Amino acid sequence: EPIGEAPLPRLRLTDSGGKPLAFGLIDQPGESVELNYTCDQDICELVVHVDGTVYRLLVGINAPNLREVGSSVFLESDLVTVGLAVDQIVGVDQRSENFSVVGTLKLSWHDPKLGFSPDQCGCTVKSFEDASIRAVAGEINLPLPSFSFYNQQGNRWSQNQVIFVTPDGRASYFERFTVTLQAPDFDFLAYPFDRQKFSIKVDLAVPTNMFIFNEIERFQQVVGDQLGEEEWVVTSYSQEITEVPFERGSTNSRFTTTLLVKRNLEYYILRIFVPLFLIISVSWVIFFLKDYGRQLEVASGNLLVFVAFNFTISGDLPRLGYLTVLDRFMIVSFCLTAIVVLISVCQKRLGAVGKQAVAAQIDTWVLVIYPLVYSLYIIWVYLRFF
Amino acid sequence: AYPFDRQKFSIKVDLAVPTNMFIFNEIERFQQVVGDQLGEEEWVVTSYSQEITEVPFERGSTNSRFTTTLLVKRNLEYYILRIFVPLFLIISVSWVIFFLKDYGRQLEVASGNLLVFVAFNFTISGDLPRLGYLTVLDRFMIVSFCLTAIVVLISVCQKRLGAVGKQAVAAQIDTWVLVIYPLVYSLYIIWVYLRFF
């Protein structure tokens, strides 16, 4: 019976092999459909097709006067429980946009097959490991889930695989891996004051009708206490399950773990910001000395130094397609310092004629523009990030 | 405490099955734990230990674990020769030129030392992680950075101050920087003796 204002869909009861057994005949009211069948064989495995190529559907067993959530369930199970945890962060590679983790995986589900009495072994749990796992189910011919790290580059070194089976049917699959993943949301526009995010995506290799992900279970802490990688610090995390499309009419489950990180600034403040502040300051304090040409000599040398600091900073970033913050600061200082040499070369010639009054007066002008500009530029950076 | 530190290394062996199915019981040394020759002359082992503990898992399952630990220390023959000798010499000579009253030359040498240090800053950072705090070697280089950009200020003040004719201030203040420079570094060393030795 549709919830409300939803067209009646097609329904059909067939056999698990595919042969049809019964069909649904609707009545004049049109708000409900009816299907009835009674088995007469030794095994009756039934499948309910609902065709629409939201709605409410009721299924019962031995329910005369079903008109007007029973004691037990009446549909099978293929719902897979998942769980992932992070133990280490081996490294981070800014320039190639990837990172690596060492974690562990837990897949567990229910199957009425693969059960066993405690008389065959005298034991209560059975264990398989390594590549013997591929040497079990094929003889029994029962479908197993198969995952895949969607955004993995290269190989995945998994050092242990184990599945424990309990007689009633429960099976728990564990795995320990070391993988390299891809991070495509790196945004350097605020470098080095940025907070990027890292994702781990686990995907099923089988369609939705054969398996899905159902619930998220944390058998362990998601983020371990010690990971290494002091340059990045984790502040949050999240886990969720979605559904992504494939092919033309097939979809599969997916399970995403996200980490949010921030960058420490103790290295950058010490190798770059301190040497750059000192060299600029002294190149402004020499302006007090009226020894001209020496003003040129120091400013020429600063041109040589900066192109060194330009190659250093570019060493550990991709060949980007836009402008960072650190790249804007160095462009400003490049252009500004090639202007003071112009003034110094103009001041030198201008003082040869005898018009020192312009030279002395214009000298004090560059004494205020130089320290004012950088303060102006900083203000333009305060608003766009803080 | 870099490079005066003594870190420790662990090897952890863990069981992949619950406690009720297997455990570790005793520790047996069928061989010497640490072989005589290992290579890696930069680190030297002074002790070792072995122990067995029990760590939790899942919700109601625990497994055995067996830990081996090594304690190591760093040799200082490389660091004393590539860094401490070149840095002591360049600072000493930049203080002994102060005897010459040729001003501006005091600026010229101090300006060059600013250029050299930023080279020594990138060299030392080459083989350390992008750390989140301050080592010892990083404090020593910060002190010398800040101090040397102060003597250029004095030299540029001394040069202009001697043009008017007041050499008495210039000569008298010249001897002041002759005592502050070698006194400070000795003060800084004392602050390092207490925190590590």
Widest Cα–Cα separation across chain A:
121
Is residue B26 part of an annotated ligand binding site?
no
* Method used experimentally: cryo-EM
CA of A258 vs chain B CAs: smallest distance (Å): 22
Chain A, window 105-144: residues with a beta carbon less than 8 angstroms from a chain B beta carbon: 125, 127, 129
Closest chain A CA to residue B139: A270
CB contact under 8 A, B111 and A231: no
Q: Any residues with CB less than 8 A from the CB of B120 and at least 6 apart, and which?
A: B83, B86, B87, B141
Q: Is A97 annotated as a binding residue?
A: yes
> Three-state secondary structure along chain A?
CCCCCCCCCEEEEEECCCCEEEECCCCCCCCCCCCCCCCCCCCCCEEEEEECCCCCCCCCCCCCCCCCCCCCCCCCCCEEEECEEEEEEEEEECCCCEEEEEEEEEEEECCCCCCCCCCCCCCCCEEEEHHHHHHCHHHHCCCCCCEEECCECCCCEEEEEEEEECCCCCEEEEEEEEEEEECCCCCCCCCCCCCCEEEEEEEECCCCCCCEEEEECCCCCCECCCCCCCCEEEEEEEEEEEEEEECCCEEEEEEEEEEEEEECCCCHHHHCHHHHHHHHHHHHHHHHCCCCCHHHHHHHHHHHHHHHHHHHHHHHCCCCCCCCCHHHHHHHHHHHHHHHHHHHHHHHHHHHHCCHHHHHHHHHHHHHHHHHHHHHHHHHHHHHHC
- Host H or E run for residue B171: helix B167-196
Q: How close B142 gets to chain A, by Cα (Å)? A: 8
Show which of residues 287-306 on chain A sit within 8 Å of chain B, judged by CB atoms.
288-289, 298, 305
Which residues pair with residue A280 across a beta bridge? none
Neighbours of A308 (CB within 10 A): 11
Token pair for A184: 């495509």
Sheet holding B8-14, edge to edge: B8-14, B61-74, B43-57
- Bond before B182 cis per omega within 30 degrees: no
> Is A371 assigned to a binding site?
no
Residue among A220, A267, A298 minimizing CB distance to B130: A267
Interface test with chain B among A128, A282, A292, A316, by most B beta carbons within 10 Å: A282
Q: Are A257 and A238 in contact (CB under 8 A)?
A: yes
Chain A residues with beta carbon closer than 8 angstroms to that of B122: 271, 312
* Mutate: best of A104, A267, A281, A292, partner B, most B CBs <10 A: A267
Distance between CA atoms of A125 and A175, rounded to whole angstroms?
A: 18
Q: Choose the closest CB to A230 out of B118, B129, B138.
A: B129
Nearest CA in chain B to A228: B129
Task: Report the distance separating Cα A165 and Cα A124, nearest Å.
Answer: 9
